[PDB]
Amino acid sequence: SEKYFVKNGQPHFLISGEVHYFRINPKLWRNHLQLLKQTGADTVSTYIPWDWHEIEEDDFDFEGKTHPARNLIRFIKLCKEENLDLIVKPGPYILAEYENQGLPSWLLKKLSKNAFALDENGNVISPDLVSYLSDEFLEYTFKWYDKVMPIISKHQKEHYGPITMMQLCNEIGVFQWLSGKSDYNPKVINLYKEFIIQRYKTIEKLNSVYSTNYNSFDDLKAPSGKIKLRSDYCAYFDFHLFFREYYNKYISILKNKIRSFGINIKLTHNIPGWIYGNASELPMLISTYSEIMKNHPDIIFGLDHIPEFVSFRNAHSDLACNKILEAMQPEAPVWAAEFQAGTREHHVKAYAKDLETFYIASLAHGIKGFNYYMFSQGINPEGKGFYGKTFYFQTALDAASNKLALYDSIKKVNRFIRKEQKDLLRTNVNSEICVGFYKPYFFTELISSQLLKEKKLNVEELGLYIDPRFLREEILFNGLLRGLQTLNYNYDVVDLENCDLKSLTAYKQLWITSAEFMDAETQNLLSEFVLNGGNLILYPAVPTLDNYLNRCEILKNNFGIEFITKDSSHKVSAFGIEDVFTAFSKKQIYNDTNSKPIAFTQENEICGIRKKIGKGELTILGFAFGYTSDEHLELIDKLVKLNKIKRELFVSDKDIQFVVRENNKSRYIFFLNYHNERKTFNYRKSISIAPFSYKVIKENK
Amino acid sequence: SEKYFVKNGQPHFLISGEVHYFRINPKLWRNHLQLLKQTGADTVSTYIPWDWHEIEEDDFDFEGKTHPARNLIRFIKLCKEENLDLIVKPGPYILAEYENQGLPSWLLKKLSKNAFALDENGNVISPDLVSYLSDEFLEYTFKWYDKVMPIISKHQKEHYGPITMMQLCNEIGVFQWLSGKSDYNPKVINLYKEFIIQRYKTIEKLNSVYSTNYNSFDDLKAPSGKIKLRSDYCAYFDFHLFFREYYNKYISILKNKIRSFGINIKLTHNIPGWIYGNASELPMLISTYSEIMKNHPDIIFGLDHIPEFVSFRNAHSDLACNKILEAMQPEAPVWAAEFQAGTREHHVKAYAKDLETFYIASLAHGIKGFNYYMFSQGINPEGKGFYGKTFYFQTALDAASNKLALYDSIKKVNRFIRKEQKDLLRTNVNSEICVGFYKPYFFTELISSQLLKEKKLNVEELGLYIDPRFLREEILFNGLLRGLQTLNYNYDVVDLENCDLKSLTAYKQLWITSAEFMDAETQNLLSEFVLNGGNLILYPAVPTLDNYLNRCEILKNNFGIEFITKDSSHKVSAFGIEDVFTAFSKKQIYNDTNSKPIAFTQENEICGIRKKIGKGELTILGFAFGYTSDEHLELIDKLVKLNKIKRELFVSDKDIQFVVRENNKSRYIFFLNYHNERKTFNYRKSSKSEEISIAPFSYKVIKENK
Ligand SMILES: OC[C@H]1O[C@@H](O[C@@H]2[C@@H](O)[C@H](O)[C@@H](CO)O[C@@H]2O)[C@H](O)[C@@H](O)[C@@H]1O
Ligand SMILES: OC[C@H]1O[C@@H](O[C@@H]2[C@@H](O)[C@H](O)[C@@H](CO)O[C@H]2O)[C@H](O)[C@@H](O)[C@@H]1O
Ligand SMILES: [Ca+2]
Ligand SMILES: [Ca+2]
Ligand SMILES: [Ca+2]
């Protein structure tokens, strides 16, 4: 049932360390590789920077002819000699705080206007930001691939070489995210037009969905500016769908070019979204890869985890991210392509004692492999560093291969992993709770995000009150997921798109965090789920619209629900819990015919009900609660207990987090203390831990 | 020389604890007061909530006639019986996680639309957010004061009562700030018009400053929408000056009303600004009080500190805030009106082990008094909680008066303070570094802030490149102030407005973080400082404009500086430090006339020089650095060492923070470990080395006699 990497036909925990040969004294390459191997790491990972090896147009140096640290060939040879497998990442983009994000200075100087990503005004967003499908950019990218890919092909594991995986580019779309600015390059706008014609066929069909009044597709312009009209929302929603196709087109062109060199090893991509030590926006970024993941089962996505610290302040971020990657990529192991080791920024400390706990928490939270980023600090050669001379701090090794505090933490965690990996990789948690992942709520990187600082989406202007980013960030990520993890209830996440009814029926409860909009297919799926005997918890709204904000009341009508939206005090009572704070004045007030009222406004109007439908059960709450009070934990706890769902353990201290992982033979109990407090507690089936620390217990069943 | 509270003509450390009588079973009031007293606290502090005591319109209960916890009179009497002095805070606003911020439900339902803060379009911003100078709001506030102030007057210290201090309202502007929208109520509009007429006298004079073409004052309105022209910036700048006069009018009106009841006690106000455990926006909010602090010597401002954790991520916030309060209020002690105890919200933990370190660091960082907020947990009666039933968590006492973990941390800190207060209160740090506080860079709460919904200020639209908010957050607060604290260099902050040359000349260095604009008065002061023998460090720009973005080249001319602004790589070299990352592509390029070039762009153009001017020294850097790399700390250290300023101690671990406080008699060494690492290090005084071992997120205090 579990997905995991395999070596010598056994479950293998992928332990990789990032070591940038191009940033290290080549005399010490062997020393770095030996010290990495001595931690029990099996793999080393590196960029192969285009800028570093194509020193001038059509002048390539992979042999150190012009600088010893250009000797990629010798670095590959050293990986083989020190019996490390190799992950290679030749771009074209690498980011990696490298000048021009890894693009050659000569290329950027020489490219035309509209090789670059453009704002609505036709101006360059950034002198290092190309348009992915620029003919110029792909021409030069292909010429780079023409030189680096034969080297990679020769040394690939399919030729019994050390190279086991290759990453395509780096964090596709990360610059549309960081600037909020969409590419308006005329090439992209033309592709968007083709995308729309293909999707709707006639202007009458599009007009019918958008309520527009185009005489033809010729009158259709890429959406820009703030959303004032539902037609604007519609045009931006399809612009989001278009960018998912665009990115799939980009990664497909790179992959096809790569396969033409006979490279048959595993291809990878890496997911950004952590900032300031939380990952509440990472689900938006992973949503941008929805078309890649459905069209390329041979590309393994890994997470870029940057927790910065390890506390109750961010404990939920890594589990929610792991669970969502599992939802969107169920046929491949959950792993971290970049797994924080040291810190990218001197002023943001990364403590060994923090990261050691993060590493163990990551095993509790289902991680199956990782690449310590950065294992080895680097020194940027001759002004190639974006931000300073030094690349990372507080790593396992400094750029001269001196051991730092993190080295012993990584050695201890790696020794645990190697001792347990055969059993641990085949364990899962027992989730009786499923939480729905409705991807369209996440499709907002161009109109609403933590990094886009002028919001184009204001749902009040559209006659709506539930903003999908507020819903997915505060009610879902920091709310329900944080609350279940705090309460030590196992959950799984499931992608609701093309979702199999049979993959929902194994769970005792399905939780759906719903805005006022939800497509007919998902409304139908949830109707069928309850009618066939599923238990659905739904809030804060029964949806009444589809993704284009056109009437769709399938779930509402199938469940016999009637409501009026009414203003009341922020606080409600729910299951006898008084003073439950809710996010909105506006609440759904439900007709209670054939229903049990279980929630009430301050004026005793019914804002939640329970009902039987066919063989199933429905709980609807017409109000939005996150986790900002003890009442929120009580409410989540009462809801879970409606279907008699039990924690795996009774633990005397409710502030201790635990994860029970088991298979037929083995149990691991992970205890995690996310608090600045020495805690002593006891447990039993349904010990002292230092601050910010952990304890792992094994049971034979 | 130090400013501190006094009792019996001796230095006295103000130790208060917040205990909300209205959220505690009144049978347990005495037990809460006795346990607070037993920590060595001398004072107890509470809100008197309007909503709680005016139960219906013109129906008042201060005696527990309708609910026993309405017996304010009894709570006051118990404070006296238990030998605690009492701070009272009767609003009208209290916030305090209380429904409607403490205003009565009946009031908010009765008030007409013009009582409320309104947006650009005339819509109510929030149903609990009044316009401060609303006739209706101030009428109801006066009727609330008519009933609560006689009780406070009768129980003052001068009538042998326990009441020693009273807070006026609560964090003026905090509610506007958190809503993300500014007040365009018609009272604001009309008072603004009167302000502009009084300020400019004629439309010709306004037009000459703004470069506008208005025919009359009737064509001019309070600015709304984004800043597109310099004239819009000018309109908003005057709007910022107006809001400071507006907040002074509000507090003057409350204060005058209070004094009429024969209330002679110390009046206080409390400063907001911490959010998510840092305080980089607090200097903006304290800046909104500039006119209150210059007109009311008798109102003492205290800080509301909410660190949430104690680590390198936020180590610099409390020191910078304490230093900025001192700069704006130099004649009163630095103190915390709200000093985090427990957590206001269940999902944000407050660990006793963090807060104990915060309390010690606060002593290191010059705090002279505080009010533990919250000392006692409460339970909201009758659904009065804004957010839930329970008021605070992980406090010193639970609502029942059981001791929690934090109680022992507070007793330990207070014991040290009571043993040491007579010396410790009279100690200072030796600050050879002064940092300039230029308040107009902070005047952006209407146009640019972390909380404002609309970004109205885009300086590139005005032909500028140095954003005043970017400068004051990243170059000063998170940059220079953070770097100096991290490097263990003592600094003072001095307000440059009406600043005495004599109060700058005691320092070895004055550091000025400058934008492209600076008023004539400040340009002239810094010019005279250097000519008379001062050592000035100025970056990232020689200013060439005044506060209205009109030509002002006083400093540039007095310092004999020629420059051109040119684009280059973000990286510069400075004092032989390569690959110093800087915020902007645009840099000032100086010619080398009568100067030593000390910084170069990637094309080897001069972006920094060192010069002698009269008897003084000038170092100017034509580029912007905060603290985002090791090069930044190296550069700050090099600049400080230009005038041979030395740390008080050699410490073997650069990541240990220390403060040395001394007087005549005593030296205190504070060691602060803001890191999740057990650290074993040695130190010595910089004028045989002692070895110290310190836990994660911990502290050591050494006292020496002499
Ligand atoms: O910067 C570190 C490392 O991270 C990867 O990109 C980061 C991304 O994960 C993150 O969400 C954002 C915002 O915090 O910063 C970076 O984009 C990247 O693949 C690596 O090259 C970087 O070295
Ligand atoms: O919320 C806790 C207490 O804090 C004060 O107001 C804070 C303010 O200091 C802070 O900057 C903002 C954002 O974090 O939140 C406000 O609540 C109040 O004066 C107290 O009444 C309140 O209980
Ligand atoms: Ca799993
Ligand atoms: Ca019905
Ligand atoms: Ca001082």
Author numbering:
A (entry chain B): 6 to 691, 702 to 716
B (entry chain A): 6 to 692, 698 to 716
From the paper:
The overall conformational change on binding of ligands is small (rmsd, approximately 0.2 Å). Thus, the wild-type (WT)-Sop2 complex was used as a representative structure in Figure 3. When the GlcN recognition residues in the TkGlmA-GlcN complex are aligned with the corresponding residues in the WT-Sop2 complex, the Glc moiety at the nonreducing end of Sop2 is well superimposed with the GlcN molecule, suggesting that Sop2 is bound at subsites −1 and +1. At subsite −1 in the WT-Sop2 complex, the distance between the carboxy group oxygen atom in the Glu343 side chain and the anomeric carbon atom (3.0 Å for both subunits) and the angle formed by the two atoms and the glycosidic bond oxygen atom in the Sop2 molecule (159° for subunit A and 165° for subunit B) are suitable for nucleophilic (in-line) attack on the anomeric center of the Glc moiety by Glu343. The carboxy group of the Glu176 side chain interacts with the scissile bond oxygen atom in the Sop2 molecule (2.6 Å between the two atoms) and is located where anti-protonation can occur. These results suggest that Glu343 and Glu176 are the nucleophile and acid/base, respectively. In the WT-Glc complex, Arg349 participates in substrate recognition to give a stable conformation, whereas Glu102 is still disordered or flips out as the ligand-free structure. In the complex of wild-type IALB_1185 with sophorose, the electron density of sophorose was clearly observed at subsites −1 and +1, whereas in the E343Q mutant–sophorose complex, the electron density of sophorose was clearly observed at subsites +1 and +2.
Here, we showed using recombinant IALB_1185 that this protein has glycosyltransferase activity toward β-1,2-glucooligosaccharides, and that the kinetic parameters for β-1,2-glucooligosaccharides are not within the ranges for general GH enzymes. Kinetic analysis further revealed that the enzyme has wide aglycone specificity regardless of the anomer, and that the β-1,2-linked glucose dimer sophorose is an appropriate donor. We propose that IALB_1185 be redefined β-1,2-glucooligosaccharide:d-glucoside β-d-glucosyltransferase as a systematic name and β-1,2-glucosyltransferase as an accepted name.
